[PDB]
Amino acid sequence: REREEWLELVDKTVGVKGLKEVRSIDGIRRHLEEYGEREGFAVVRTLLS
Amino acid sequence: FLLKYQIYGDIDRDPAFGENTMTAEVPVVWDKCEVEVKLYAGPLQKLMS
Amino acid sequence: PRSRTAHRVDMVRECDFNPTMNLKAAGPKARLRGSGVKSRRRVSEVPLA
């Protein structure tokens, strides 16, 4: 983000990767897979530097 | 309907206070508030033909 | 943080694809029936559903 922000000095407005939309639901989910009960990482905390 | 319960003193080798156990009687009367049932999609049966 | 303005990204367009076989899956059909109660299929489409 800030790399592209610093890239703004010379040129601007041409970047892209990773498609658009997603779907999965119509009432209920099957749910036979991943959970993550405990979740915390350094980034979420007030340390964006 | 009343509910007789009784507490005890444990672990500490008790003296003669005239009370090791207590007595608690809980009165419970039934109350009525409106019911509101809702229907959503769940798993279906086999139904083999 | 604040240097330069605008820019941003235009997401690229891509196709979608599937598990390869002719027949319909039992789950997706049986589970589609759990939500609605139509006799024949509103929209008038079987495969796209």
Curated annotation (Swiss-Prot), chain A:
Give the residue spans that cross the bilayer. none
Quaternary structure and interacting proteins, as annotated:
Homomultimer.
Q: Which domain of life is it from?
A: Viruses
Gene name per UniProt: p2
Which organism does this sequence originate in? Answer: Penicillium chrysogenum virus (isolate Caston/2003)
Compartments, record wording: Virion
Under which name does UniProt file this protein?
Capsid protein
Q: What does this protein do?
A: Capsid protein self-assembles to form an icosahedral capsid with a T=1 symmetry, about 35-40 nm in diameter.
UniProtKB/Swiss-Prot annotation, chain B:
| Compartments, as annotated in UniProt | Virion
User: Which purpose does this protein serve, as stated in its record?
Assistant: Capsid protein self-assembles to form an icosahedral capsid with a T=1 symmetry, about 35-40 nm in diameter.
Q: What subunit structure does UniProt give? A: Homomultimer.
Name listed for the protein in its UniProt record: Capsid protein
- Organism in which the protein naturally occurs: Penicillium chrysogenum virus (isolate Caston/2003) (PcV)
Q: Which gene encodes it?
A: p2
